[model samples]
Target: RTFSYTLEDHTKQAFGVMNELRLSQQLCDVTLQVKYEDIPAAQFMAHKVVLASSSPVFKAMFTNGLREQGMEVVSIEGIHPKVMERLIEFAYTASISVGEKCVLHVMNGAVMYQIDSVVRACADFLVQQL
Candidate 1:
C-alpha cells in the first residue's frame, strides 16, 4: 500500500451557495424566459455572474464586459423549458441530469449557448448509450 490522501467526505461550498440562490431566487440579476408552448412560458431567475462564468455567449450578451444590460429577461428560441432550466441549474450547481428522451434537446441548448463542457458531457453520454 502507498501513502494515501483520503477524506471521508468531500464537500464543495460553491454547490451549496448556488443551490440556495436558485431556491430563494434572491438577488438574481437576470431571468431566463423559457418559451415552450407545452407549458405556460417558464422563467428561471439567476445571477449574471454564474451565467457569464459558464457561457461566453451570455457574457457577450450581458457585458461584452462592462455595465450589465437591464433587459434581463432572456429567452432561447426553439428550446423546451425543462431543457433550458437544466442548463442553468448545471451552471449554478455544477451538475445536470440528462435522460434518454431529453438528451438531444439538452445538447442543442448546450451548443447554442457555447458551453463546451456541457456539450462534451452530452457527447460522452451519447457514446455510452449508443
Candidate 2:
C-alpha cells in the first residue's frame, strides 16, 4: 500500500496531536520538524516510501527509526555518525527478521541495495547536529 500526505497535512496533524496531548504549538512544530522529516528520504530507496506517505505516521515512523534509538534528530539537514551507525545496525538486524524477501515491480526489473546511500546521507547530516 501507499501513503498520502503533505507538509501542511503533517503540520495539522502535529497541531491536532499536540492539542490532544496538551502540548504547546511551538513544541509541536519544533518536534515535528526536528524529530521528523516533512518527508524522510534520507536514503536513496526511501524516495518512493517518503513520497507515498508524507503523513504524520510516516514522520512518526521516521522519528522512531532515528530518535527512538537515542539517535539525535535535530534540524540542519544532515546526518550524524551515530545515525549512520544505527542504520547499519538496523539493516544488519533486519536481515535476519525476514524469510524470502522479494523485490518485484509492475513495470521494470532492477535490484538495488541502499544501505550505503543511507550511510552517506547520515554522514552528511553530521554537521547538522542538535
Candidate 3:
C-alpha cells in the first residue's frame, strides 16, 4: 500500500468482462423500464452493482427506487425507449452513440441520472455537428 501503478489495460479488460456478462444476462439484479406517454413499456435488465458503480443517481435510485422479491424495477419517464436503451447500455459498455435524433433525450436522461460523462459526450457530439 505504498506504491501506485496504473493497470489501465487490466481495467479495460475487466470492463469488457462485465460488459460480456451483461450480454449474457448473468448476475443481473434489476430491471429498468422506460415508460413515456403510456407507450408500451420497454425495458433493460442490469446489475445493481454495475449501475451503482456507474452513476450516483443510480446509486440513490437503487437505495429508494423500487423493490421486489429477487430484483428491483425502476421505471423512468421523459425518456424514449431508444434513448433509454442506449443510456443503460452506456452504463455497461462505457460508450454511447449520440445523434440529432436522440441526443437531446439521452442528454436529458443522463442529467436525471447524474451521468455527467454522458452529458459531456452529448455536448461534444453536438459541437461536432455544429
Candidate 4:
C-alpha cells in the first residue's frame, strides 16, 4: 500500500509542529543565538532537530561531539544579523522575501551557509524581478 499527501498536508501537519517548536523554545535542547553586538540580535530560540534537518553544517556541528555539540547556545558569526534573521526565518517557514538591494547579500549568505534551497529561491526571485 502507498500513502499520499499534498503540500498543504505536510505544511499544516509537519511544518505546523516545527513552527510550534520554534515558538515555544522550551525543552528545545539547543539554540542558535547571535553573539556579535554589531549584528542584529536574534535567537533560534530553539533547535537541534530542526536545524540539523535544514543544513548538514548544523547537523555536523550538533552531532560531531565537538565543543558546539555541548554548548547550549551556538555562536553565529560573519553573516549580517539581518541576513541571519532572514535565514533563520526561512529555516522555520521555508519562506523569504528578497528585494533588489539585499538579494545578493541574502544569496551570498545562503550560499555560505550551504542552504541551497534558499539560494535557489533568492536566485529565482531575482530572475523574476529582472
Candidate 5:
C-alpha cells in the first residue's frame, strides 16, 4: 500500500536532518547531483504517498495522519456524501485492474486521489529537505 505525509512534514524532516549533517557549502549545493550519481545516505525511510479519493471517509482517514505529522488538511464542497461514495467505489474497482499503477487525477479542483503503479515499494519512498 502507498503511505503519504504532508509536504510540510516532509520538508521539516528533511531540513532538520540535512542541517544536522551540516555539509560544506559546495557539498550541500551538490547533494542532489551526488544522489543522482550514486546511492544516497544510508537509505530513504520516508515514503510519502498521495491519495486521489474525494471520499469523505478516505479524506478523514488521511487527515488524521496529516495532523499527526503537523500538516494541515483542507477540504471543499466536492466532497459530498454521494460523490464520495462513488469515488471510493471507483478506487476499489480501479485498483483491481491497474494494480498500483492506476492513477486518479482530480480536475476542476475536486478532492480526489490520482493513483499510480509502484514497482518497488521501497523505491517509492523519498526525502524532501528545505
Candidate 6:
C-alpha cells in the first residue's frame, strides 16, 4: 500500500485574512458612493490594497500616480448600482451571486475590470443556467 501524509491547512489560514478584511469594514480607504434612479443612494466601500490585489486595473488606478490615487471616493459609471456593489463584494470575498437579472451586467463589469476569476465564474454560471 502507498503511504501518504496529510498537509497543513494553509489554504484556510490564507483565506482567513481576506475574510477578516471583508468583515472588518473599518479600514477601508476608498469608497464607491453614488446615486441611481433604482436606489437613490448606493454605496460600496473597500480597501485599496484589497482592490489592487484582485484586479490589475485597480492596481494601476491606485499606483500609477493617477487622479484616483488621491481620491477617497470614486465613481464607477456605465454600470448599474447593484452590479457595482456585487463586483466590489466579489473583489473582497472571491464570491458573487449571479441571478438571471444581473448575470450579464456583472459579467460585463468583470470583463471591463479584467478580473479573470469573476469573468470565468460569470461565464460558467451562464452556461449552467442555459
Give a tens-digit lDDT track for model 2, residues 1-130.
9999667576556434534442222222222121224545343122212211322333454546544443223332333323432332333232211111211110001111244333344444443553
Q: Evaluate all candidate structures by whole-model CA lDDT and list the values in order.
A: 0.81, 0.31, 0.80, 0.76, 0.30, 0.77
Model 3 earns a TM-score of 0.80
TM-score of 6: 0.73
Q: Model 6: which ten-residue window has the lowest total lDDT?
A: 10-19
- Residue pairs with colliding backbones in model 1 are none
Per-candidate RMSD, Å: 5.2, 17.4, 3.1, 3.5, 20.2, 4.9
- By summed lDDT, which 10 consecutive residues of candidate 2 come out lowest? 103-112
lDDT score, candidate 2, position 73: 32
Residues 12-122, model 1: lDDT tens digits: 576568769767998788888878776788888988877888898888878854555456787756888889888888887788887777787899999988889979888
Candidate 3 shows a clash count of: 0
Q: Candidate 3, residue 32: CA error in Å? A: 1.3
Per-residue error for 128 in candidate 1, Å, reads 3.4
Q: Compose the digit string of candidate 6's lDDT tens values, residues 3-79.
A: 99876976556555765775686677888765555666666777888889888888987787766446888777677
Could you tell me every candidate's TM-score relative to the true structure? 0.80, 0.17, 0.80, 0.75, 0.22, 0.73
- The runs of at least 3 residues in candidate 3 whose Cα sits more than 4 Å from the true structure, single-residue gaps closed, are 1-7, 64-71, 127-130
User: Cα lDDT for residue 96, model 1?
Assistant: 88
Whole-model lDDT, model 4: 0.76
Model 3, C-alpha of 78: deviation from truth (Å): 1.9
lDDT of 3 by residue, 9-110 (tens): 886788779888887878778877789887899877788888888889888767775655734677778888878888778887888887677787788889
Pairs of colliding residues, candidate 2:
3-52, 78-125, 79-125, 79-126
Candidate 2 off by > 4 Å? 1-17, 20-69, 76-130
* Candidate with more favorable, higher TM-score: 2 or 3: 3
RMSD (Cα, Å) of model 1:
5.2
